[PDB]
Design an enzyme around this catalytic site. Structure first.
Site, PDB file in Angstrom:
ATOM      1  N   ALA A   1       0.767  -1.254   0.000  1.00 18.56           N
ATOM      2  CA  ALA A   1       0.000   0.000   0.000  1.00 18.56           C
ATOM      3  C   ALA A   1       0.800   1.308   0.000  1.00 18.56           C
ATOM      4  CB  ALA A   1      -0.988   0.010   1.195  1.00 18.56           C
TER       5      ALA A   1
ATOM      6  N   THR B   1       3.559   2.462  -2.091  1.00 14.70           N
ATOM      7  CA  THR B   1       4.088   3.096  -3.297  1.00 14.70           C
ATOM      8  C   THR B   1       3.311   2.595  -4.515  1.00 14.70           C
ATOM      9  OG1 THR B   1       5.775   1.390  -3.786  1.00 14.70           O
ATOM     10  CG2 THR B   1       6.434   3.172  -2.301  1.00 14.70           C
TER      11      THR B   1
ATOM     12  N   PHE C   1       6.203  -2.915   3.236  1.00 15.68           N
ATOM     13  CA  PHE C   1       7.499  -3.298   3.767  1.00 15.68           C
ATOM     14  C   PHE C   1       8.464  -2.153   3.485  1.00 15.68           C
ATOM     15  CE2 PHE C   1      11.480  -5.811   3.702  1.00 15.68           C
ATOM     16  CZ  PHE C   1      11.319  -6.522   4.877  1.00 15.68           C
ATOM     17  N   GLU C   2       8.647  -1.275   4.473  1.00 17.08           N
ATOM     18  CA  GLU C   2       9.387  -0.032   4.254  1.00 17.08           C
ATOM     19  C   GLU C   2      10.348   0.258   5.414  1.00 17.08           C
ATOM     20  OE1 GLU C   2       9.311   1.332   1.449  1.00 17.08           O
ATOM     21  OE2 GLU C   2       7.424   0.672   0.539  1.00 17.08           O
TER      22      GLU C   2
ATOM     23  N   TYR D   1       8.857  -9.802 -20.776  1.00 14.82           N
ATOM     24  CA  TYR D   1       7.789  -9.782 -19.783  1.00 14.82           C
ATOM     25  C   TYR D   1       6.779 -10.932 -19.924  1.00 14.82           C
ATOM     26  CZ  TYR D   1       5.059  -8.037 -15.914  1.00 14.82           C
ATOM     27  OH  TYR D   1       4.396  -7.944 -14.709  1.00 14.82           O
TER      28      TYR D   1
ATOM     29  N   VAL E   1       6.130   4.410 -14.535  1.00 12.08           N
ATOM     30  CA  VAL E   1       7.406   4.426 -13.828  1.00 12.08           C
ATOM     31  C   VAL E   1       7.162   4.053 -12.368  1.00 12.08           C
ATOM     32  CG1 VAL E   1       9.351   5.853 -13.025  1.00 12.08           C
ATOM     33  CG2 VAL E   1       8.369   6.224 -15.327  1.00 12.08           C
TER      34      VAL E   1
HETATM   35  N1  LIG Z   1       4.627  -0.669 -12.349  1.00 13.01           N
HETATM   36  C1  LIG Z   1       4.174  -1.078 -13.549  1.00 13.01           C
HETATM   37  O1  LIG Z   1       4.427  -0.780 -14.831  1.00 13.01           O
HETATM   38  C2  LIG Z   1       3.116  -2.130 -13.457  1.00 13.01           C
HETATM   39  C3  LIG Z   1       2.942  -2.840 -12.300  1.00 13.01           C
HETATM   40  N2  LIG Z   1       1.925  -3.835 -12.200  1.00 13.01           N
HETATM   41  C4  LIG Z   1       1.763  -4.661 -10.946  1.00 13.01           C
HETATM   42  O2  LIG Z   1       1.283  -3.857  -9.904  1.00 13.01           O
HETATM   43  C5  LIG Z   1       1.761  -4.406  -8.715  1.00 13.01           C
HETATM   44  C6  LIG Z   1       2.538  -3.374  -7.955  1.00 13.01           C
HETATM   45  O3  LIG Z   1       3.660  -2.968  -8.697  1.00 13.01           O
HETATM   46  P1  LIG Z   1       4.284  -1.525  -8.499  1.00 13.01           P
HETATM   47  O4  LIG Z   1       3.213  -0.495  -8.285  1.00 13.01           O
HETATM   48  O5  LIG Z   1       5.077  -1.235  -9.751  1.00 13.01           O
HETATM   49  O6  LIG Z   1       5.293  -1.797  -7.317  1.00 13.01           O
HETATM   50  P2  LIG Z   1       5.999  -0.857  -6.235  1.00 13.01           P
HETATM   51  O7  LIG Z   1       7.460  -1.203  -6.256  1.00 13.01           O
HETATM   52  O8  LIG Z   1       5.720   0.607  -6.447  1.00 13.01           O
HETATM   53  O9  LIG Z   1       5.314  -1.252  -4.867  1.00 13.01           O
HETATM   54  C7  LIG Z   1       5.408  -2.527  -4.311  1.00 13.01           C
HETATM   55  C8  LIG Z   1       4.689  -2.605  -2.994  1.00 13.01           C
HETATM   56  O10 LIG Z   1       4.886  -3.878  -2.463  1.00 13.01           O
HETATM   57  C9  LIG Z   1       5.365  -3.730  -1.147  1.00 13.01           C
HETATM   58  N3  LIG Z   1       6.176  -4.852  -0.768  1.00 13.01           N
HETATM   59  C10 LIG Z   1       7.211  -5.399  -1.446  1.00 13.01           C
HETATM   60  N4  LIG Z   1       7.611  -6.518  -0.780  1.00 13.01           N
HETATM   61  C11 LIG Z   1       6.814  -6.665   0.302  1.00 13.01           C
HETATM   62  C12 LIG Z   1       6.767  -7.603   1.310  1.00 13.01           C
HETATM   63  N5  LIG Z   1       7.687  -8.694   1.320  1.00 13.01           N
HETATM   64  N6  LIG Z   1       5.844  -7.494   2.284  1.00 13.01           N
HETATM   65  C13 LIG Z   1       4.962  -6.455   2.284  1.00 13.01           C
HETATM   66  N7  LIG Z   1       5.007  -5.527   1.288  1.00 13.01           N
HETATM   67  C14 LIG Z   1       5.930  -5.631   0.310  1.00 13.01           C
HETATM   68  C15 LIG Z   1       6.072  -2.447  -1.118  1.00 13.01           C
HETATM   69  O11 LIG Z   1       6.149  -1.981   0.180  1.00 13.01           O
HETATM   70  C16 LIG Z   1       5.197  -1.638  -1.987  1.00 13.01           C
HETATM   71  O12 LIG Z   1       4.127  -1.130  -1.258  1.00 13.01           O
HETATM   72  C17 LIG Z   1       2.621  -5.539  -9.091  1.00 13.01           C
HETATM   73  O13 LIG Z   1       1.880  -6.797  -9.017  1.00 13.01           O
HETATM   74  C18 LIG Z   1       2.998  -5.296 -10.474  1.00 13.01           C
HETATM   75  O14 LIG Z   1       3.252  -6.479 -11.119  1.00 13.01           O
HETATM   76  C19 LIG Z   1       1.023  -4.026 -13.282  1.00 13.01           C
HETATM   77  C20 LIG Z   1       1.061  -3.202 -14.372  1.00 13.01           C
HETATM   78  C21 LIG Z   1       2.327  -2.461 -14.707  1.00 13.01           C
HETATM   79 NA    NA Z   2       2.161  -1.192  -5.224  1.00 12.17          NA
END
Ligand SMILES: NC(=O)C1=CN([C@@H]2O[C@H](COP(=O)(O)OP(=O)(O)OC[C@H]3O[C@@H](n4cnc5c(N)ncnc54)[C@H](O)[C@@H]3O)[C@@H](O)[C@H]2O)C=CC1
Ligand code: NA
Length: 405
Positions: A55, A57, A80-81, A241, A281
């Site tokens: 939740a 980022t 996880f921050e 991907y 991004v």
């Molecule tokens: N960023 C992109 O271009 C896209 C992302 N997605 C999907 O959206 C989802 C989120 O990706 P993003 O927004 O890019 O990631 P992000 O890197 O911005 O955020 C990841 C989140 O997961 C949390 N996290 C990571 N490991 C954790 C753990 N062991 N325990 C608890 N929390 C943990 C972080 O604290 C953070 O809140 C992913 O499933 C990704 O595959 C889907 C479409 C494209």
């Molecule tokens: Na996220």
């Protein structure tokens, strides 16, 4: 001498890593996302009690903001921050979450968060406990984790994800953001063990473990709904991907969503969908081979079309159109699609043509690398308007109602 406890924080970037984050800037970035949502207006028929796993980022933060400030939901976030401390800025997700709690309280909305490993049984139990105490049940669960590793909650085995092609090695063009050069490298294919580990981390097992655990605890409401975010992408990204090791994991999500939907639809007509979003991004995406170049190209093409979106705009429309609206925008697999503007044939064709033409010399004529760099810095709270980056700030920002796992 309060300056002894404060510092001037500047970006320190290395490839797709920034080792600093600015507390005031992250707060401003969160406020900007909130203001987008409140400017667009409320979303009718949304959930009122929401668990967001991941939740702090990116898309998960956007979902929390959309649920809270768009749907008026009480929100429980898991992430996880690293907290800040003297001389050492915490992670952007920590500061984002601090800001979220501040703004949610100002609006009279419940905000509680749990910091720890979401893959662990302990965190699931702490989460169950918080729901019971505070909310009774939740109506929606957002699964939005992006992680390079997972410790299996039973065997203690550590699984590491890999971002590699499958089958054949691939020549991937990319942009080295430090040296600002267009470069190719050959990525070797993943081994079976690497594919399996990637599925273990980014596949759907943990999502399943979450829903089952909440279910067995009696903390999911009638008509409850859950979604995990996924990415299919343009054909040009398929080698690394969708048809790569990360794609093998996202395809596993597809082998999970059926069982999940099955459990909820008997529980008051609840639902589950994998939701497909556009590339943006993020800390996660920036680390994927080819993505900085692809994003720089996509941003240019979509801006020309008036269709460019960041996290908040994408998720707001997902809630409004698909999660709470009458347009699941279903695909043949039963996925919710919110990514069609990226996949439009005319967009794909234009990105592909530019991909073939870009060189060191024409980067700024053919791409929106400028926009990429700006959005990347924004993630960590840098370059935000109205923020005074020359002022000392205390990196130790505290969060009320934050359970440390
Ligand atoms: N960023 C992109 O271009 C896209 C992302 N997605 C999907 O959206 C989802 C989120 O990706 P993003 O927004 O890019 O990631 P992000 O890197 O911005 O955020 C990841 C989140 O997961 C949390 N996290 C990571 N490991 C954790 C753990 N062991 N325990 C608890 N929390 C943990 C972080 O604290 C953070 O809140 C992913 O499933 C990704 O595959 C889907 C479409 C494209
Ligand atoms: Na996220």
């Amino acid at each position: 001498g309060s300056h002894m406890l404060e510092m001037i924080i500047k970006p320190r970037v290395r490839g797709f890593i920034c080792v600093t984050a600015h507390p005031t800037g992250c707060e401003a970035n969160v406020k900007k996302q909130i203001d987008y949502v409140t400017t667009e207006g409320p979303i009718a028929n949304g959930p009122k009690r929401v668990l967001v796993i991941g939740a702090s980022t990116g898309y998960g933060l956007a979902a929390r903001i959309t649920a809270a400030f768009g749907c008026g939901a009480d929100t429980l976030g898991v992430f996880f921050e690293r907290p800040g401390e003297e001389g050492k800025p915490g992670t952007s997700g920590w500061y984002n979450s601090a800001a979220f709690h501040k703004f949610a309280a100002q609006k009279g909305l419940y905000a509680k968060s749990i910091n720890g490993d979401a893959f662990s049984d302990e965190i699931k139990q702490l989460t169950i406990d918080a729901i019971k105490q505070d909310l009774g049940q939740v109506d929606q669960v957002i699964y939005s984790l992006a992680s390079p590793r997972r410790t299996h909650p039973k065997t203690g085995e550590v699984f590491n994800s890999a971002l590699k092609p499958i089958g054949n090695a691939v020549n991937l063009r990319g942009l080295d953001t430090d040296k600002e050069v267009i470069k190719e490298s050959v990525l070797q294919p993943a081994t079976q063990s690497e594919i399996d580990s990637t599925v273990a981390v980014m596949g759907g097992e943990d999502w399943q473990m979450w829903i089952d655990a909440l279910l067995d605890a009696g903390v999911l409401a009638e008509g409850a709904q859950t979604t995990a975010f996924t990415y299919l992408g343009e054909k040009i990204t398929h080698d690394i991907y969708w048809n790569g090791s990360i794609g093998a994991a996202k395809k596993d999500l597809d082998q999970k969503v059926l069982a999940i939907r099955e459990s909820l639809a008997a529980h008051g007509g609840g639902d589950a969908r994998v939701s497909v979003l556009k590339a943006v991004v993020s800390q996660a995406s920036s680390a994927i081979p080819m993505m900085p170049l692809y994003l720089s190209l996509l941003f240019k093409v979509m801006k020309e079309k008036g269709t460019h979106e960041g996290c908040i705009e994408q998720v707001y429309s997902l809630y409004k159109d698909s999660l709470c609206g009458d347009s699941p925008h279903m695909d043949q697999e039963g996925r919710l699609r919110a990514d069609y503007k990226e996949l439009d044939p005319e967009v794909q064709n234009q990105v592909q043509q530019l991909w073939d033409q870009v060189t060191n010399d024409n980067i700024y004529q053919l791409t929106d690398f400028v926009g990429y760099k700006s959005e990347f810095l924004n993630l960590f709270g840098f370059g935000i308007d109205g923020v005074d980056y020359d002022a000392d700030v205390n990196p130790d920002v505290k969060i009320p109602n934050l359970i440390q796992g």
